[PDB]
């Protein structure tokens, strides 16, 4: 997200989520937020909306 | 210094003086080369992310 | 030669732990075992994650 093009990648398509997951593959919070799949989906949606807001 | 960015050109109307962008704060010519190296932490992380994709 | 060598002990009393490789010095200390002040004048902090546990 340091690059200003992160917002453009987010607005492009769902591939930005894959890019963030590849860069953030070691997200310990991703494993903490993984037990609740609906919670992880809501968190990802809220992050995408805040980035695209 | 902001007083070392003055220029003008006498083309059609006269010597139109101008100045670069220094209204925010002082001019930081070399803020830090550390920002334009991608240090060994970023290097190792990007390698762990990139060599796997290469394979 | 001891005048050219350097030891670095670690126990309940010596939480610091020094290194001096061929390049720059280094000092490691835990993140959940009563860490030091952690000054961090620059943005140099190596979050050495656990290989198996994946924790700082």
Swiss-Prot record, chain A:
Regions that span the bilayer: none
Induction details: Up-regulated in brain tissue from patients with Huntington disease.
Origin: domain of life: Eukaryota
Tissue: Detected in brain neurons.
Domain FF as annotated: residue spans: 1-50
Disulfide bonds: none
Subcellular location: Nucleus
UniProt function note: Transcription factor that binds RNA polymerase II and inhibits the elongation of transcripts from target promoters. Regulates transcription elongation in a TATA box-dependent manner. Necessary for TAT-dependent activation of the human immunodeficiency virus type 1 (HIV-1) promoter.
Record's comment describing the protein's domains: The FF domains bind the phosphorylated C-terminus of the largest subunit of RNA polymerase II, probably mediate interaction with HTATSF1 and preferentially bind peptides with the consensus sequence [DE](2-5)-[FWY]-[DE](2-5). The WW domains bind Pro-rich domains.
UniProt protein name: Transcription elongation regulator 1
Organism: Homo sapiens (Human)
Curated annotation (Swiss-Prot), chain B:
UniProt tissue specificity: Widely expressed.
Domain of life, per lineage: Eukaryota
Residues that bear Phosphoserine: 23
Location within or outside the cell: Nucleus; Nucleus speckle
Subunit and interaction comment: Part of the U5 snRNP complex. Component of the U4/U6-U5 tri-snRNP complex composed of the U4, U6 and U5 snRNAs and at least PRPF3, PRPF4, PRPF6, PRPF8, PRPF31, SNRNP200, TXNL4A, SNRNP40, DDX23, CD2BP2, PPIH, SNU13, EFTUD2, SART1 and USP39. Component of the U5.U4atac/U6atac snRNP complexes in U12-dependent spliceosomes. Within the minor spliceosome, which acts on U12-type introns, interacts with PPIL2 and RBM48. Core component of U2-type precatalytic, catalytic and postcatalytic spliceosomal complexes. Found in a mRNA splicing-dependent exon junction complex (EJC) with SRRM1.
Role of this protein: Plays a role in pre-mRNA splicing as core component of precatalytic, catalytic and postcatalytic spliceosomal complexes, both of the predominant U2-type spliceosome and the minor U12-type spliceosome. Functions as a scaffold that mediates the ordered assembly of spliceosomal proteins and snRNAs. Required for the assembly of the U4/U6-U5 tri-snRNP complex, a building block of the spliceosome. Functions as a scaffold that positions spliceosomal U2, U5 and U6 snRNAs at splice sites on pre-mRNA substrates, so that splicing can occur. Interacts with both the 5' and the 3' splice site.
Disease: Retinitis pigmentosa 13: A retinal dystrophy belonging to the group of pigmentary retinopathies. Retinitis pigmentosa is characterized by retinal pigment deposits visible on fundus examination and primary loss of rod photoreceptor cells followed by secondary loss of cone photoreceptors. Patients typically have night vision blindness and loss of midperipheral visual field. As their condition progresses, they lose their far peripheral visual field and eventually central vision as well.
Domain notes: The MPN (JAB/Mov34) domain mediates interaction with TSSC4 and SNRNP200. Has structural similarity with deubiquitinating enzymes, but lacks the residues that would bind the catalytic metal ion. Contains a region with structural similarity to reverse transcriptase, presenting the classical thumb, fingers and palm architecture, but lacks enzyme activity, since the essential metal-binding residues are not conserved.
Protein name: Pre-mRNA-processing-splicing factor 8
Organism (species): Homo sapiens (Human)
Lineage of origin: Eukaryota, Metazoa, Chordata, Craniata, Vertebrata
Included stretch of the parent chain: 1336 to 1390 of 2335
């Amino acid at each position: 997200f340091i690059t200003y093009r992160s917002k453009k990648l987010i607005q492009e398509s769902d591939q930005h989520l894959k890019d963030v997951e590849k860069i953030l593959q070691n997200d310990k919070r991703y494993l903490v937020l993984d037990c609740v799949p609906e919670e992880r989906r809501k968190l990802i949606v809220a992050y995408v909306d805040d980035l695209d807001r | 210094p902001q007083s070392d960015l003055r220029w003008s050109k006498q083309t059609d109307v006269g010597i139109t003086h101008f100045r670069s962008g220094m209204s925010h704060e002082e001019d930081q010519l070399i803020p830090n080369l550390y920002r334009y190296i991608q240090p060994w932490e970023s290097e190792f992380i990007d390698s762990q992310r990139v060599w796997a994709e290469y394979a | 030669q001891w005048e050219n060598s350097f030891v670095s002990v670690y126990s309940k009393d010596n939480p610091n732990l020094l290194f001096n490789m061929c390049g720059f010095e280094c000092r490691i200390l835990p993140k959940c075992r009563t860490s030091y002040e952690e000054f961090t004048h620059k943005d140099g902090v190596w979050n050495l994650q656990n290989e198996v546990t994946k924790e700082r």
